[PDB]
């Protein structure tokens, strides 16, 4: 079950391994389009959070689920901000979301007075007046129940067939690693010139024991120059100083 676009599942993904299974290479999706990230680098990157916005749309409106777009869904049902980090993933659902007489459990906002804000749900049943007559609770002549059903039926056109779309909204990791790709651990090498990754702060240097006393919440640390001075080892919590290689 996916929501019609009126509401959507917004389950938050955290404290886990975001193995993205190179889904973009699975060919199970018609659309797999990333904006603030390269789709091939998703397994290297860490996020504080990933949110998966999950809903059903018509094929001709797949193109509207993108930042900065306009259209009936983009403006009244599901809006993405111009500034967006995440990936839009979509695929055909004829054998789940379509019924012979039409699946009418999927509805979208058709009649709205103003645009929807980025990422807010509408979930409204307010009767909309398209004319000058108050039509107060009349729901006819010139006013409408705002939510319209879709003719999701098995032999309709490809642009009318339902598609499942999931938008993965990303919060870049400003936090201790929370959501990351399928990284492998290594041993710890002190001294010598080492190319290191941790939870980010990728760089090269010589890792040595630190005499710094970090407060229990700090994790990381910097110099006057805004450079990394020291890093708390994500495992066992030893503080290591980072010295540039000669």
């Amino acid at each position: 079950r996916f929501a019609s676009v009126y509401a959507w599942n917004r389950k938050r993904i955290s404290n886990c391994v975001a193995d993205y299974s190179v889904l973009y290479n699975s060919a199970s999706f018609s659309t797999f389009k990333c904006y603030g990230v390269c789709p091939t680098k998703l397994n290297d990157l860490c996020f504080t959070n990933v949110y998966a916005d999950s809903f059903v749309i018509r094929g001709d409106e797949v193109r509207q689920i993108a930042p900065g777009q306009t259209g009936k869904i983009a403006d009244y049902n599901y809006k993405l901000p111009d500034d967006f980090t995440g990936c839009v993933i979509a695929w055909n659902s004829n054998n789940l979301d379509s019924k012979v007489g039409g699946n009418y459990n999927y509805l979208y906002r058709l009649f709205r007075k103003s645009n929807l804000k980025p990422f807010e749900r509408d979930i409204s049943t307010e009767i909309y007046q398209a004319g000058s007559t108050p039509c107060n609770g009349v729901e006819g002549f010139n006013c409408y129940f705002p939510l319209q059903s879709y003719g999701f039926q098995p032999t309709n056109g490809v642009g009318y067939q339902p598609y499942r779309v999931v938008v993965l909204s990303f919060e870049l990791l400003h936090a201790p690693a929370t959501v990351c790709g399928p990284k492998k651990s290594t041993n710890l090498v002190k001294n010598k010139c080492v190319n290191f990754n941790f939870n980010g702060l990728t760089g090269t240097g010589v890792l040595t024991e630190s005499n710094k006393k970090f407060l229990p919440f700090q994790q990381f640390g910097r110099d006057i120059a805004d450079t990394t001075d020291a890093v708390r080892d994500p495992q066992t919590l030893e503080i290591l100083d980072i010295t540039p290689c000669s």
Partner: antibody, heavy 122, light 103 residues
């Protein structure tokens, strides 16, 4: 343009009356079709309307139960069924086009292209 | 629902005389009215829209005015061919109509 109506008929009370208004061109989506009752020698009463573009129908309260309205997407045709036929309910009835419309729901006011109507009695 | 009363029930005029036709609504219809002309046995033809504007194909002698609940049609000179029953159409209903007859 035109609404092509069904002819006249006489039926036993309780037997449903079903007629239709066929039209060429992109009228299913371009116009709303309304059904109006005109007992002979009388003025007009609204029965109901179908907005085929939105798959929705509105009815006059006095005609609820009594009137069922639908439409066919292939060769735009409006259909109406009058249930619970009574000899008292003898009338000429017709389809009319709500000329002001849009795919943006601009909203309707008046009508044109009236089909005049078909007499149905007992 | 919205209900309309028309007046006079019957208008008796000589050809060439000025006709005034009144329509009164139970509640406001804003400007959502249309006027139609009925020949006996016929469904009436469009004359006016949005409660005042002359419909395409209609002679300049026919025009209206009014708002909310109070509406009217002025026929500057009523010709023999114009002695029709005049009706006001409300959003979802019709008024009783005025039968215009030759005196």
């Amino acid at each position: 343009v035109q609404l092509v109506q069904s002819g006249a008929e006489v039926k036993k009370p309780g037997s449903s009356v079903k007629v239709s208004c066929k039209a060429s061109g992109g009228t299913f989506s371009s116009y709303t079709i309304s059904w109006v009752r005109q007992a002979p020698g009388q003025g007009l009463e609204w029965m109901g309307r179908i907005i085929p573009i939105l798959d929705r129908v509105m009815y006059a309260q006095k005609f609820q139960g009594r009137v069922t309205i639908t439409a066919d997407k292939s060769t735009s045709t409006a259909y109406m069924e009058l249930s619970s036929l009574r000899s008292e309910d003898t009338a000429v009835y017709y389809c009319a086009r709500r000329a002001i419309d849009s795919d943006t729901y601009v909203e309707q006011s008046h009508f044109d292209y009236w089909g005049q109507g078909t007499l149905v009695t007992v | 629902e919205i209900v309309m009363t028309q007046s006079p029930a019957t208008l008796s005029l000589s050809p060439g005389e000025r006709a005034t036709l009144s329509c009164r609504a139970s509640q406001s219809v804003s400007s959502y009215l249309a006027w139609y002309q009925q020949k006996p046995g016929q469904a009436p033809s469009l004359l006016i829209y949005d409660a005042s504007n002359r419909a395409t194909g209609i002679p300049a002698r026919f025009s209206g005015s009014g708002s909310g609940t109070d509406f009217t049609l002025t026929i500057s000179s009523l010709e023999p061919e114009d002695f029709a029953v005049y009706y006001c159409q409300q959003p979802l209903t019709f008024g009783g109509g005025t039968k215009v007859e030759i005196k």
